[PDB]
Amino acid sequence: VPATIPLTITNNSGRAEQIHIYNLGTELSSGRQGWADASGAFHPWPAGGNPPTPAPDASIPGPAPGRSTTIQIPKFSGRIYFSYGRKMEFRLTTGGLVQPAVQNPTDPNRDILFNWSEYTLNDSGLWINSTQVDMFSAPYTVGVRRGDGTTLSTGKLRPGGYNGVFNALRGQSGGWANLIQTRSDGTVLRALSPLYGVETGALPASVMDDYINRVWNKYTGTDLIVTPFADRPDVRYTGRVSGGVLRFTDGSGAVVTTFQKPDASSVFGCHRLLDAPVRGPISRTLCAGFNRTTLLANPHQPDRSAAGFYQEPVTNHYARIIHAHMADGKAYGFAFDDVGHHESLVHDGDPRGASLTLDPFD
Numbered sequence: 001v002p003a004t005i006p007l008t009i010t011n012n013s014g015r016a017e018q019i020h021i022y023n024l025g026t027e028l029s030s031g032r033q034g035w036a037d038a039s040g041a042f043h044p045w046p047a048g049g050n051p052p053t054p055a056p057d058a059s060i061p062g063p064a065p066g067r068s069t070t071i072q073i074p075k076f077s078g079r080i081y082f083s084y085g086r087k088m089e090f091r092l093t094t095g096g097l098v099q100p101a102v103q104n105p106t107d108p109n110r111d112i113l114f115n116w117s118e119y120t121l122n123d124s125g126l127w128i129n130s131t132q133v134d135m136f137s138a139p140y141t142v143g144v145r146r147g148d149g150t151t152l153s154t155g156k157l158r159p160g161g162y163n164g165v166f167n168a169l170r171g172q173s174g175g176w177a178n179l180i181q182t183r184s185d186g187t188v189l190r191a192l193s194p195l196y197g198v199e200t201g202a203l204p205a206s207v208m209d210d211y212i213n214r215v216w217n218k219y220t221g222t223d224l225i226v227t228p229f230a231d232r233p234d235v236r237y238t239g240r241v242s243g244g245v246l247r248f249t250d251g252s253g254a255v256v257t258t259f260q261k262p263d264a265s266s267v268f269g270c271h272r273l274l275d276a277p278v279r280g281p282i283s284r285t286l287c288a289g290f291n292r293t294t295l296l297a298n299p300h301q302p303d304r305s306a307a308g309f310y311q312e313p314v315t316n317h318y319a320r321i322i323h324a325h326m327a328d329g330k331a332y333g334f335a336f337d338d339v340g341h342h343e344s345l346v347h348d349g350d351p352r353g354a355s356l357t358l359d360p361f362d
């Protein structure tokens with residue numbers, strides 16, 4: 001893999017605003033945090049602070065509407081941000097870059113229309129994704145040009161898919177409507193993911209309690225079988241609830257990890273009581289099972305297909321809605337949407353190019 005590969009950025013947004021691009025991350029060779037310019041040259045961040053201090057302006061001019069621009073991506077792991085009209089405000093902590101946190105009303109970027117893609121380019125190739133784990137906002141498609149010349153892309157919404165997602169969220173009772181951040185003139189900016197919905201109080205900690213209690217009941221009397229390694233189908237852990245705790249035993253008979261009854265933040269964020277540091281792979285499987293609400297219906301996890309996902313009346317509706325509106329049915333609606341390979345990521349071992357397309361607000 002060469003030192004850099006070209007990233008073609010195409011503006012199909014139909015919007016008149018100028019685009020600012022940021023390529024922010026960590027340089028492979030040095031492990032330093034910083035930014036890369038259009039040439040692919042790396043610029044380490046200056047020293048940050050506690051409290052965090054302002055980052056220098058790392059923007060690259062993005063493509064005008066109907067045109068594309070190319071930047072070189074070095075071996076680097078990070079994000080390509082793009083913002084419409086306004087420049088983003090980044091700050092630097094002791095340990096480096098602070099990521100935006102627009103669930104906070106006071107975040108400097110709360111009112112800015114922006115999104116990002118996540119990528120890693122290294123000696124083993126390119127991984128590049130479309131993600132909705134934090135929010136659903138300005139739409140985009142990512143792609144790779146593979147060694148053999150073939151292309152792969154993902155992240156593209158169906159026609160009407162952008163407004164379709166908001167309209168579906170607004171009509172979902174229980175607090176999902178309060179995920180939507182709407183401008184003064186009624187223009188939608190973004191919808192927060194449900195993890196941040198729990199944080200902001202849009203959704204209660206208890207929103208999944210009834211389903212979770214049904215799962216814990218079911219697996220008090222019968223086994224939950226988790227086979228968490230896709231390439232090792234014979235490796236199984238057996239889960240059973242006793243004393244209110246879901247305990248997993250390995251083939252040797254040892255209890256290897258245990259789960260307390262999870263809450264909404266744990267499920268939606270794939271963290272806390274569902275932390276995924278042998279526990280990690282098991283937790284990952286359970287996380288996807290709770291978000292897709294398949295644990296009750298299918299005691300042999302993970303699911304072998306998507307047919308039974310999101311059928312419960314209370315489920316991760318944000319993830320359900322986004323998947324339903326994606327052209328290829330794939331999305332990153334929650335952190336472990338990669339379970340069963342349903343995530344909007346593409347990769348190649350010998351890339352030579354990538355793409356980011358700013359999509360229309362349709």
Ligand SMILES: OC[C@H]1O[C@H](O[C@@H]2[C@@H](O)[C@H](O[C@@H]3[C@@H](O)[C@H](O[C@@H]4[C@@H](O)[C@@H](O)O[C@H](CO)[C@H]4O)O[C@H](CO)[C@H]3O)O[C@H](CO)[C@H]2O)[C@H](O)[C@@H](O)[C@@H]1O
Nearest residue numbers: 118119120127128129131133269270271276332334335336
């Ligand atoms: O509860 C949250 C849980 O997940 C968190 O965030 C995930 C985050 O890991 C993520 O990162 C993507 C990577 O999965 C992907 O990694 C590639 C691997 O698949 C591997 O095989 O090789 C290559 C090269 O080493 C890796 O790059 O790389 C992509 C780059 O496109 C990453 O974006 O994306 C999802 C969705 O945004 C996040 O939700 C968090 O990291 C964990 O701490 C948490 O436990």
